[PDB]
Paper text:
UPF3 is a key nonsense-mediated mRNA decay (NMD) factor required for mRNA surveillance and eukaryotic gene expression regulation. UPF3 exists as two paralogs (A and B) which are differentially expressed depending on cell type and developmental stage and believed to regulate NMD activity based on cellular requirements. Here, we show that UPF3A and UPF3B share structural and functional homology to paraspeckle proteins comprising an RNA-recognition motif-like domain (RRM-L), a NONA/paraspeckle-like domain (NOPS-L), and extended α-helical domain. Here, we report two crystal structures of the RRM-L and N-terminal region of the middle-domain of UPF3B and UPF3A bound to the MIF4GIII domain of UPF2.
To further analyze UPF3A’s higher affinity to UPF2-MIF4GIII, we crystallized UPF3A-58–206-Iso1 with UPF2-MIF4GIII. Resulting crystals diffracted to a resolution of 2.95 Å and were phased using the UPF3B-41–189 + UPF2-MIF4GIII structure. As expected, the architecture of UPF3A and UPF3B is highly conserved as well as the interface between UPF3A and UPF2-MIF4GIII. Surprisingly, UPF3A-58–206-Iso1 had an affinity of 220 pM for UPF2-MIF4GIII, binding 16-fold tighter than UPF3B-41–189. One such region is a 6-residue hairpin of the RRM-L between β2 and β3 of UPF3B and UPF3A (N85 and T87 changed to A102 and L104 in UPF3A) where a shift in the register occurs. In UPF3A, the register shift spanning residues 102–109 (85–92 in UPF3B) (compare left and right panels) alters the positions of side chains of both UPF2 and UPF3A. The side chain of residue D103 (D86 of UPF3B which is not involved in binding) binds the pocket and forms a polar contact with the side chain of N815. In the NOPS-L α-helical region of the UPF3A structure, the terminal end is better resolved relative to the UPF3B structure. UPF3A E187 could form an additional polar interaction with the backbone of UPF2′s K767, likely stabilizing the terminal end of the NOPS-L binding interface. In summary, UPF3A binds with ∼10-fold higher affinity than UPF3B, mainly relying on an additional interaction between the NOPS-L and UPF2-MIF4GIII domains, and to a lesser extent on a structural rearrangement in the β2-β3 hairpin of the RRM-L domains.
Residue numbers in the entry:
A (entry chain D): 767 to 1011
B (entry chain C): 66 to 158, 163 to 186
C (entry chain B): 767 to 1014
D (entry chain A): 65 to 160, 162 to 188
E (entry chain F): 767 to 1012
F (entry chain E): 67 to 160, 163 to 187
G (entry chain G): 66 to 129, 131 to 159, 164 to 186
H (entry chain H): 767 to 1010
């Protein structure tokens, strides 16, 4: 029902990449008619829609892209912009039918950093957008972050699980420490909502997910036990920045 | 010194030509690309475009001109555009010999044996 | 800081209204200057703001109003109109800080039926509003009913536990059984959303509170085990519509 | 019978009955017309409303069509699209028993008086 | 019935210290047995309890300590830590009977900067604490900052009147500009409270105090005339701060 | 930052009881202790200051002691406070002052004792 | 197809509240702005108002105020003209500098130029 | 005699605003108290009264407004509405003392289209109103268009000489080609009047203005040399429209 070339590039990206070697598929893809803008626009869409790939095989797509741009420069910038675009659009529409689609995109963005396609500045800008875009600054729920919506946390942990272990030396070391403190406050904003009672406690899977990611990144750091401690940590962090010029 | 700006949440039925006309006169630029909607997110189609300004001081006027500018689709629904710094600020900076030869390949040829009946 | 009249009314309704002081307080309330438009309006506000009363003392104010209308016929209408207004506004505003405020309101409406302040049509009209207002007909989530938002379930179960036990004879029995068919479909619309996974399941507390109320109402209830089964129940019920409406 | 009580809700809080009576004039025949102000307890969400009971249960079609969605404006100029639907409680105050003898006699009460003694000392 | 040596120290600091006799007092304190830990502690506490000295002679104690550290290197650190501690404890306790005492401690902390005993960071770190410690981020009244409690403002102004004149050059100037942006928002949280009405208005004496110190420090600053104007100015600041963070 | 303050302790704890209660104790070149001054009648608390060699033992030290409830002799609970001291300067080694301990042999002190002799 | 209508050639000494009374009951509308007379043409002073109706199908009736005789306090006919506004755009919804001219060095230099 | 802030905006608009000082005037205009309805009211009136500006510097005011609406979008709407009001009212009043005042207003409307403040439709509806409003269809003179009154021609050429060169591609091409037919007939209605004698001929100055203007827009056409020709071209135009 679909053209044969289109089905072939899909067979390479969504099937052959988790089975064979990335080089076998890379040269196969270099031989595609890249001068034809029709097929080029199609393969880019296939890579952006990485939700069709097995979650554990997504790094193969980043590895492949890192090499394919040595021969098709513009495809690299187009997929990255698309991935970052779908991460934004996913937050705006915020529909449950796109949750697995959005988790993969976040994972893909993390693997694109591991293979040096984007730099930490892009990853930290995306990390903050998860805890700030559509978020009322007073901590009140809003349309884009309703009270019982915890998907922002699952996105932050998805990215931190894939490339946060490399933010432990030099500049990126403390930029991650600074994002975490703002993330712990966002966490406690949600925990402090009235919807969480004794019979309806905070989802325990989210608590385990947060403690696990923090345990890996910073083993010696302990999540706060109150909202006041989190509001202090941010107040102390930004206060010291205001004092150091 | 950021120079790449994105115009997103445009109507899906819009193309590059009516965009360039609407934003006429386009401030000078070495990069100007337009991207259509994904179609797999059926209810939420939005096209977008990227412009890399040569003088990163002309975007203050550009951002105040078109950030929020209401675009119209066929039926007449309002698509207020969004003009921000592109979240990825890199742009396209011999030729390959394999380009355009996949039809003369054994792996592709054998695949056709599987796909056609 | 407050007028003495107003604070006295607040002590009467929020502090002095025990289970056996109802009559004592009613006679204290008959003495109020009801010809004054200001204090009357204020007293009605106090009764609508029922969240200031302890949950288990809410039936007391309903009992109070049932007797107070024998001498002030108009105050009965004004309180119910405000309670039904606040229930609807709660759904339109839908902020967590008003949850206890809205649970108490739903309780009040249930008690007002027990003391013959409203008829069963009011209670059912409101129950359907919990499962239809702001709800998309396809089951998809919306702005007034986000995916993980299950407060409508707790409001429906708050009313059914308060007065649903009186819907088991004659017309009032079938009118409830038809609602529960629609209620079960709304429940299964929530269960079948993508947010609920194997690690983040449908809150068992909500499952528990649903089963407890239906067991309390219809012990033989045929609990739908799927979304399709609840949809069939609705489709079969709508067949009954069009024979009793005259179109099939 | 047929429904006859109509509610006009989600009106601006700063709207008075005279202001509404002018914007609605000339409203059809009605035995009941009451206006109710905002509550203030839900401080961010103040809305006034009115209730009208029509004599002919068919002039509502015209009235609803004229005001269901009508935009009201406050001092700041924010828009308040009104909601005009059947009131969820169809009963109204009916003219009628003998007046109550104790109405307005709380000031001449010992329990109250004692309360004033205790409330006189506050803060 | 006080021991002889102790009363002599109290006479030196609270009575004999009158601006001009400072060198004579310093040499008299150098002769004290500093290696006796007990006597050292009492002397340090005498300087921490600065409320026993006349307000306009408080700077004298700071000058004395500036010369005393040329011979007892540890006492300079001990007094500052004691004063900062007394400031924080004053906020925690928050009882009006200690108000005049807490105003003296702020003056002393201000004078300690004028005599190069504390760095610029300690002053602004203490200033911010006045506007944040025990303060809810939404501007709502709290246990340590009730509605009619405006002592925090009086403390901010006592320090800015003592050493704000020297925050006019380079980085120190920029630090003060940022703090004032936060300080004005705190002021407007207090004004917007429910307790201040037409019959119970915001004390005009506090308004006059605020405008005076601000006009003395920055004569060209535009005062915020609304709680919205204050919240906008703060968001504009932290908007520029996050870009340099990451 | 390396200096840490231990404050809101019991007024009766002396330094070695603190040093005992705070065992094990990471590396620290600075360890000052301050009791409570009698003056402030109702609110008497002792405190301590510690400058850690490697500024990272505070992450382990704070969580171990921040909130540690101490007890007074009469049986009163004292939730402790652990935070970075607001003044981050410490003492360093140095010649001594010749006048130290000479006040007893001074005329001005002598004539004061005379006026103080007759209470 | 249009929705913006102009009510022009009104009396100059007319205010908006008075006009809203004469027009009562107006059809629904998003836009209703009133503009007094300019004073630059003393002999030819006319106020006007613009309305943007929500339903573009009720203008035919409102048009059929076209010729409405408005009167001033002194007494004189001002037959209002109701036509489709020649410009059919209305603005519908902040700057940081708004209201900063008082604290400005060029305007302060101007005050030195104009006050003395 | 006038408050200082009012005299300042007059200095910015009627003196300081030359071709090169627009950038400094804009930022200075953004700081005015736009929340005060009285100041903003007066500002709009100052711009509508474009006759106070040097004719050749009028385009600067349009450019100023084009950027001033990026921060005060409401003000551009009222300035245009006021300009169109004064164009219409100028025709209804029609006194020679307001001629250069109305010439300046017509110029302003043209420049407002150049900086994309009004669409082509607003320009053509005004162009036709000059040749129709107050004009009797049978060609005879009327109260608002007496015989020797040729100011409509002077107005039309004022607008076409400032933005008509931009009407030669696509839709706006046909629209203008059709207005010139009705304009040619109006011109000939005025030429065919009995007031023009040998010693009192049709003003040669105005006819040169017609030839010069039409030369700049469309070099492919010369004005009709006869009234009947102009009538024939209108009849042809309307017939071909009805048939297609
Ligand atoms: Cl105070």
């Amino acid at each position: 029902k679909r053209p044969p070339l289109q089905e072939y590039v899909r067979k390479l990206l969504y099937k052959d990449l988790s089975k064979v070697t990335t080089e076998k598929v890379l040269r196969q893809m270099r031989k595609l008619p890249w001068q034809d803008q029709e097929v080029k626009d199609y393969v880019i869409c296939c890579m952006i829609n990485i939700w069709n790939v097995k979650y554990n095989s997504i790094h193969c797509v980043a590895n492949l892209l890192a090499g394919l741009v040595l021969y098709q420069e513009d495809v690299g910038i187009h997929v990255v912009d698309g991935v970052l675009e779908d991460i934004r659009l996913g937050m705006e529409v915020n529909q449950p039918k796109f949750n697995q689609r959005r988790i993969s995109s976040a994972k893909f963005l993390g693997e694109l950093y591991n293979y040096r396609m984007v730099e930490s500045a892009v990853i930290f800008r995306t990390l903050y957008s998860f805890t700030s875009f559509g978020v009322n600054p007073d901590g009140s729920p809003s349309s884009l972050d309703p009270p019982e919506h915890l998907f922002r946390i699952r996105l932050v942990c998805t990215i931190l699980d894939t490339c946060g272990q490399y933010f432990d030396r030099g500049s990126s070391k403390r930029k991650l420490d600074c994002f975490l403190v703002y993330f712990q406050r966002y966490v406690w904003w949600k925990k402090s909502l009235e919807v969480w009672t004794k019979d309806h406690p905070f989802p325990i899977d989210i608590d385990y997910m947060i403690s696990d990611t923090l345990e890996l990144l910073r083993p010696k750091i302990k999540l706060c036990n109150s909202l006041e401690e989190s509001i202090r940590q941010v107040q102390d962090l930004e206060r010291e920045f205001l004092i150091k010029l | 010194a950021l120079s790449k700006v994105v115009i997103r949440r445009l109507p899906p039925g819009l193309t590059k030509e009516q965009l360039e006309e609407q934003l006429r006169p386009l401030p000078a630029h070495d990069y100007f690309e337009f991207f259509a909607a994904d179609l797999s997110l059926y209810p939420h189609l939005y096209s977008r475009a990227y412009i890399n300004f040569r003088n990163p001081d002309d975007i203050l006027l550009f951002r105040d001109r078109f950030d929020g500018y209401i675009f119209l689709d066929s039926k007449g629904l309002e698509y207020p555009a969004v003009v921000e710094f592109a979240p990825f600020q890199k742009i396209a900076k011999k030729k390959d010999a394999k380009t355009g030869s996949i039809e003369d390949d054994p792996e592709y040829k054998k695949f056709l044996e599987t796909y056609c009946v």
